[PDB]
Design an enzyme around this catalytic site. Structure first.
Site, mmCIF file in Angstrom:
data_model
loop_
_atom_site.group_PDB
_atom_site.id
_atom_site.type_symbol
_atom_site.label_atom_id
_atom_site.label_comp_id
_atom_site.label_asym_id
_atom_site.label_seq_id
_atom_site.Cartn_x
_atom_site.Cartn_y
_atom_site.Cartn_z
ATOM 1 C CG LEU A 102 37.876 18.518 44.139
ATOM 2 C CD1 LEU A 102 38.559 18.839 45.610
ATOM 3 C CD2 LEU A 102 37.507 16.939 44.097
ATOM 4 C CD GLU A 142 42.022 18.197 51.176
ATOM 5 O OE1 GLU A 142 42.377 17.346 51.791
ATOM 6 O OE2 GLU A 142 41.867 18.271 49.769
HETATM 7 N N1 LIG Z 1 36.726 14.981 46.900
HETATM 8 C C1 LIG Z 1 37.466 13.904 46.617
HETATM 9 O O1 LIG Z 1 38.376 13.559 47.548
HETATM 10 C C2 LIG Z 1 37.499 13.055 45.402
HETATM 11 C C3 LIG Z 1 36.596 13.365 44.338
HETATM 12 N N2 LIG Z 1 36.391 12.979 43.077
HETATM 13 C C4 LIG Z 1 35.100 13.429 42.426
HETATM 14 O O2 LIG Z 1 34.189 12.354 42.254
HETATM 15 C C5 LIG Z 1 33.870 12.064 41.040
HETATM 16 C C6 LIG Z 1 34.201 10.454 40.959
HETATM 17 O O3 LIG Z 1 33.889 9.959 40.031
HETATM 18 P P1 LIG Z 1 33.020 8.763 40.112
HETATM 19 O O4 LIG Z 1 31.654 9.151 39.171
HETATM 20 O O5 LIG Z 1 32.643 7.878 41.650
HETATM 21 O O6 LIG Z 1 33.815 7.728 39.082
HETATM 22 P P2 LIG Z 1 35.081 6.894 39.219
HETATM 23 O O7 LIG Z 1 36.201 7.338 39.136
HETATM 24 O O8 LIG Z 1 34.531 5.768 40.289
HETATM 25 O O9 LIG Z 1 34.957 6.290 37.652
HETATM 26 C C7 LIG Z 1 33.650 5.441 37.375
HETATM 27 C C8 LIG Z 1 34.110 4.518 36.421
HETATM 28 O O10 LIG Z 1 35.442 3.752 36.694
HETATM 29 C C9 LIG Z 1 35.566 2.494 36.159
HETATM 30 N N3 LIG Z 1 35.536 1.741 37.537
HETATM 31 C C10 LIG Z 1 35.113 1.979 38.645
HETATM 32 N N4 LIG Z 1 35.273 1.124 39.702
HETATM 33 C C11 LIG Z 1 35.616 -0.015 38.872
HETATM 34 C C12 LIG Z 1 35.881 -1.324 39.190
HETATM 35 N N5 LIG Z 1 36.065 -1.719 40.515
HETATM 36 N N6 LIG Z 1 36.396 -1.965 38.423
HETATM 37 C C13 LIG Z 1 36.711 -1.669 37.081
HETATM 38 N N7 LIG Z 1 36.335 -0.626 36.727
HETATM 39 C C14 LIG Z 1 35.693 0.553 37.479
HETATM 40 C C15 LIG Z 1 34.474 2.990 35.017
HETATM 41 O O11 LIG Z 1 34.194 1.752 34.390
HETATM 42 P P3 LIG Z 1 34.087 1.616 32.723
HETATM 43 O O12 LIG Z 1 35.100 2.281 31.984
HETATM 44 O O13 LIG Z 1 34.349 -0.028 33.079
HETATM 45 O O14 LIG Z 1 32.856 1.958 32.262
HETATM 46 C C16 LIG Z 1 33.388 3.350 35.784
HETATM 47 O O15 LIG Z 1 32.326 4.048 34.829
HETATM 48 C C17 LIG Z 1 34.467 13.250 39.997
HETATM 49 O O16 LIG Z 1 33.414 14.271 40.178
HETATM 50 C C18 LIG Z 1 35.855 13.530 40.819
HETATM 51 O O17 LIG Z 1 36.146 15.086 40.472
HETATM 52 C C19 LIG Z 1 36.946 11.760 42.801
HETATM 53 C C20 LIG Z 1 38.035 11.200 43.859
HETATM 54 C C21 LIG Z 1 38.044 11.886 45.098
HETATM 55 C C1 LIG Z 2 41.842 11.603 42.882
HETATM 56 O O1 LIG Z 2 41.772 12.840 43.902
HETATM 57 C C2 LIG Z 2 42.588 13.766 43.665
HETATM 58 C C3 LIG Z 2 43.695 13.509 42.866
HETATM 59 C C4 LIG Z 2 44.246 14.701 42.628
HETATM 60 C C5 LIG Z 2 44.127 16.030 43.320
HETATM 61 O O2 LIG Z 2 44.798 16.928 43.470
HETATM 62 C C6 LIG Z 2 45.971 17.410 43.842
HETATM 63 C C7 LIG Z 2 46.750 17.677 42.672
HETATM 64 C C8 LIG Z 2 46.664 19.217 42.953
HETATM 65 C C9 LIG Z 2 46.099 19.620 41.350
HETATM 66 C C10 LIG Z 2 45.275 21.093 41.212
HETATM 67 O O3 LIG Z 2 45.927 21.945 41.694
HETATM 68 O O4 LIG Z 2 44.609 20.981 40.494
HETATM 69 C C11 LIG Z 2 43.062 15.763 44.226
HETATM 70 C C12 LIG Z 2 42.195 14.760 44.439
HETATM 71 C C13 LIG Z 2 40.948 14.944 45.346
HETATM 72 C C14 LIG Z 2 41.425 14.843 46.909
HETATM 73 C C15 LIG Z 2 41.631 15.934 47.639
HETATM 74 N N1 LIG Z 2 41.927 15.897 48.986
HETATM 75 C C16 LIG Z 2 41.893 14.636 49.499
HETATM 76 N N2 LIG Z 2 42.221 14.574 50.772
HETATM 77 N N3 LIG Z 2 41.763 13.423 48.941
HETATM 78 C C17 LIG Z 2 41.493 13.656 47.789
HETATM 79 N N4 LIG Z 2 41.255 12.546 47.208
#
Ligand SMILES: NC(=O)C1=CN([C@@H]2O[C@H](COP(=O)(O)OP(=O)(O)OC[C@H]3O[C@@H](n4cnc5c(N)ncnc54)[C@@H](OP(=O)(O)O)[C@@H]3O)[C@@H](O)[C@H]2O)C=CC1
Ligand SMILES: COc1ccc(OCCCCC(=O)O)cc1Cc1cnc(N)nc1N
Length: 186
Positions: A22, A30
């Protein structure tokens, strides 16, 4: 199978990640909100399903994988089987959603939660149908390398209240944030 939903926490500059973590320091409450929303199933004898990209999976610390009390599905075209700890693997979002209707899952899944990353969010948000976005607004800019896709507000209506979602400004570690729920149906 119940509702389709995305959940995300996002900075003012649309940032969701930096170097596989993050962009901001841990915000414990959160994270609690995330766990609560994704884990809580309205339907007895069912669990919610979480769908995530491969990098999102590996960004969750190992001690928290799989996300407990939820069925964990990873998206990847490179992987040949689910990662250690993961429950399912699909090659696309449509495939994952289809699977949820199969005999093995039809009876077991309540809500489905798309938990990232950018490309899974984008496809989900642009696919016609009934979809909600649970969006936490981190009310500061943070240096990021991955971003939330644009929310089209013509489609996604911001709900004026939602049961179990605090409406006021939250603050942890000097960082102000607020919870929002958006809903489209097209
Ligand atoms: N703040 C938040 O709420 C959240 C934050 N994050 C953060 O964001 C970043 C997220 O990563 P991001 O780079 O977008 O990566 P993703 O998690 O989307 O992963 C990308 C990889 O997932 C596969 N993939 C993605 N979409 C598809 C699909 N439709 N079908 C098949 N395979 C797929 C991989 O493929 P393959 O093996 O095919 O190459 C592709 O390279 C991290 O830094 C994480 O910490 C993530 C979720 C929530
Ligand atoms: C995939 O996104 C997330 C998955 C897990 C997550 O942490 C939850 C468990 C606590 C673990 C620790 O303390 O390290 C958080 C996210 C990201 C996320 C955060 N907040 C919201 N609203 N949406 C998300 N996807």
């Amino acid at each position: 199978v119940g509702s389709l939903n995305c959940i995300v926490a996002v900075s003012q500059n649309m940032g969701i990640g930096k170097n596989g973590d993050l962009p901001w320091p841990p915000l414990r409450n959160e994270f609690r909100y995330f766990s609560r929303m994704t884990t809580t199933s309205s339907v007895e004898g069912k669990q919610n399903l979480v769908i995530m990209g491969k990098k999102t999976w590996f960004s969750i610390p190992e001690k928290f994988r799989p996300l407990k009390g939820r069925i964990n599905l990873v998206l990847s075209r490179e992987l040949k089987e689910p990662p250690q700890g993961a429950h399912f693997l699909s090659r696309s979002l449509d495939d994952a959603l289809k699977l949820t209707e199969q005999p093995e899952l039809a009876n077991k899944v309540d809500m489905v939660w798309i938990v990232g990353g950018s490309s899974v969010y984008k496809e989900a948000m642009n696919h016609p149908g009934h979809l909600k976005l649970f969006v936490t607004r981190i009310m500061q800019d943070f240096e990021s390398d991955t971003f939330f896709p644009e929310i089209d507000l013509e489609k996604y209506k911001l709900l004026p209240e939602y049961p179990g979602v605090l409406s006021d400004v939250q603050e942890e570690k000097g960082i102000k944030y607020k919870f929002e729920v958006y809903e489209k149906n097209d």
